[PDB]
Amino acid sequence: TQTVSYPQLIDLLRRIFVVHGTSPEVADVLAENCASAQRDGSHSHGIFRIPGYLSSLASGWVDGKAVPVVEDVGAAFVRVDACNGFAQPALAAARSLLIDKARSAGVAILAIRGSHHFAALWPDVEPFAEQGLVALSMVNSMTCVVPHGARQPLFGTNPIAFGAPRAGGEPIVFDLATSAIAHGDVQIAAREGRLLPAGMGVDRDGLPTQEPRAILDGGALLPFGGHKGSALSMMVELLAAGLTGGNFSFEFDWSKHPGAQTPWTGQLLIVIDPDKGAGQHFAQRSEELVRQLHGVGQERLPGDRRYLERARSMAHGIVIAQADLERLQELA
Ligand X SMILES: O=C([O-])c1ccc[nH]1
- Whether 222 has a binding-site annotation, put simply, is no
Count interface residues toward ligand X (CB under 6 A): 9
Choose, by CB under 6 A, the member of 94, 112, 173, 177 that binds ligand X: 177
Count interface residues toward a copy of itself (CB under 8 A): 72
- Whether 151 has a binding-site annotation, put simply, is no
Is 277 among the residues that bind a copy of itself (CB under 8 A)?
Answer: yes
- Whether 324 has a binding-site annotation, put simply, is no
CB-based contacts of 210, cutoff 8 Å, min separation 6: 195, 196, 197, 198, 200
- Whether 300 has a binding-site annotation, put simply, is yes
Is 183 among the residues that bind ligand X (CB under 6 A)?
Answer: yes
Is 205 among the residues that bind a copy of itself (CB under 8 A)?
Answer: no
Task: Answer yes or no: 104 catalytic.
Answer: no
Closest CB 229 distance from a copy of itself, rounded Å = 6
CA distances for 16 relative to 46, 86, 264, angstroms:
14, 16, 22
Task: Answer yes or no: 100 catalytic.
Answer: no
- Of the pair 182, 202, the CB lying nearest ligand NDP is at 182
Is 194 among the residues that bind ligand NDP (CB under 6 A)?
Answer: no
Is 113 among the residues that bind ligand NDP (CB under 6 A)?
Answer: no
Is 157 among the residues that bind ligand X (CB under 6 A)?
Answer: yes
Choose, by CB under 6 A, the member of 33, 42, 44, 115 that binds ligand X: 44
Is 293 among the residues that bind a copy of itself (CB under 8 A)?
Answer: yes
Is 225 among the residues that bind a copy of itself (CB under 8 A)?
Answer: yes
Task: Answer yes or no: 44 catalytic.
Answer: yes
Which amino acid type is present at position 128? F
Residues 36, 232, 246, 140, CA torsion sign:
positive
**What number of other Cβ atoms are within 10 A of residue 187's Cβ?**
16
Choose, by CB under 6 A, the member of 25, 203, 211, 304 that binds ligand NDP: 304
Judged by CB under 6 A, the chain residues 169 through 188 that form the site for ligand NDP are: 174-177, 181-182, 184
- Whether 248 has a binding-site annotation, put simply, is no
24 binds, among ligand X, ligand NDP, a copy of itself, none (CB under 5 to 8 A by kind): none
Separation of alpha carbons 106 and 2, rounded Å? 47
| Residue stretches of the annotated binding site for NADP(+) | 117-121, 175-177, 227-228, 300-306
| Contacts to ligand X by CB under 6 A | 44, 118, 141, 157, 177, 182-184, 263
| Contacts to ligand NDP by CB under 6 A | 42, 44-45, 117, 119-122, 139, 141, 148-149, 157, 159, 174-177, 181-182, 184, 227-228, 231, 300, 302-306
Residues identified as active-site: 44-45, 185
